[PDB]
Amino acid sequence: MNRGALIKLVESRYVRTDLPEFRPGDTVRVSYKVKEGNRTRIQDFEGIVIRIRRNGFNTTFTVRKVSYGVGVERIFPLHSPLIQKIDIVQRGRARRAKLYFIRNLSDREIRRKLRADRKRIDQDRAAERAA
RNA sequence: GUUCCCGGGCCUUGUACACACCGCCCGUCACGCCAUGGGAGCGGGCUCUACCCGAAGUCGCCGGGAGCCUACGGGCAGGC
Ligand SMILES: [Mg+2]
Ligand SMILES: [Mg+2]
Ligand SMILES: [Mg+2]
Ligand SMILES: [Mg+2]
Ligand SMILES: [Mg+2]
Ligand SMILES: [Mg+2]
Ligand SMILES: [Mg+2]
Ligand SMILES: [Mg+2]
Ligand SMILES: [Mg+2]
Ligand SMILES: [Mg+2]
Ligand SMILES: [Mg+2]
Ligand SMILES: [Mg+2]
Ligand SMILES: [Mg+2]
Ligand SMILES: [Mg+2]
C-alpha cells in the first residue's frame, strides 16, 4: 500500500489551485469569511506574510500588520474554504525564509529591510496582459 | 534711751505700684482651642536634560527593472 498516497487522496477534495502564489516579504490582502451577529461577512486582513509552513495540503501562512497601534499576526490555512480571495498588493524581497525579525523593527527599518522585489513586479505585469 | 516691734508727722530717693506692697509680676507642669516648623514618606503641578520612535506638512534628492500626461532637456504619481 502507499500510505502517503491515500492521505493526499482524502485531502484532494479540499485542495485549491485558484489562489495566487506569494512569498514571505510580500504584502497581501486576505479576504476572510467571518461570522458575528447574526450574519456572515467578508473581513479583509492586509499585511506582510512573515512565514510559510509547508505540508502539502496542510500548508499554512502567517500575516502580520499593525492595527491601531498594536501588532497583529494572523495565521491562515492556505486551502481554507473560508478564504474568498488573496490579493497581492506588493512584492517584497527577503533574503530569509522566515521573517520573525521584523517584530522588533521600526516602520522605517522594515521599509529599508524589505525592498520591493522589482523583478517579480515586472513579472506580475508581464502577465496581466490577456488574450 | 529711740537700736529693735506697731502706728503716725515733715523733707528727700527709687518704682514696671495707681484695685496704689493685702500693689505688681516670671517660667515650668496639667487641660482645651488655633496656627506654624521638622518628619520614614505619600500624592500633584510646572520644568530641564539625554536618547529611542515619529503623523500631517514644507523643503531637498530621486523619479530607474517602472506607471499616467505631454505641453517629452517637462509634469504628476511613486520612493528616499
Ligand atoms: Mg505523510
Ligand atoms: Mg492509491
Ligand atoms: Mg516707721
Ligand atoms: Mg511737722
Ligand atoms: Mg518716703
Ligand atoms: Mg508681696
Ligand atoms: Mg507640615
Ligand atoms: Mg516638607
Ligand atoms: Mg514625589
Ligand atoms: Mg514630584
Ligand atoms: Mg534608547
Ligand atoms: Mg527623526
Ligand atoms: Mg521622467
Ligand atoms: Mg513627489
From Swiss-Prot:
InterPro entries in the cross-refs: Ribosomal_bL19 (IPR001857), Ribosomal_bL19_CS (IPR018257), Ribosomal_bL19_sf (IPR038657), Translation_prot_SH3-like_sf (IPR008991)
Pfam families reported in the protein's UniProt record: Ribosomal_L19
CC annotations in GO: cytosolic large ribosomal subunit
Keyword Zinc attributed: no
One Gene Ontology molecular-function label: structural constituent of ribosome
Listed PANTHER family: LARGE RIBOSOMAL SUBUNIT PROTEIN BL19M (PTHR15680:SF9), RIBOSOMAL PROTEIN L19 (PTHR15680)
Subunit structure and binding partners: Part of the 50S risobomal subunit. Contacts protein L14. Forms a bridge to the 30S subunit in the 70S ribosome, contacting the 16S rRNA.
Protein name as catalogued: Large ribosomal subunit protein bL19
Gene name as annotated: rplS
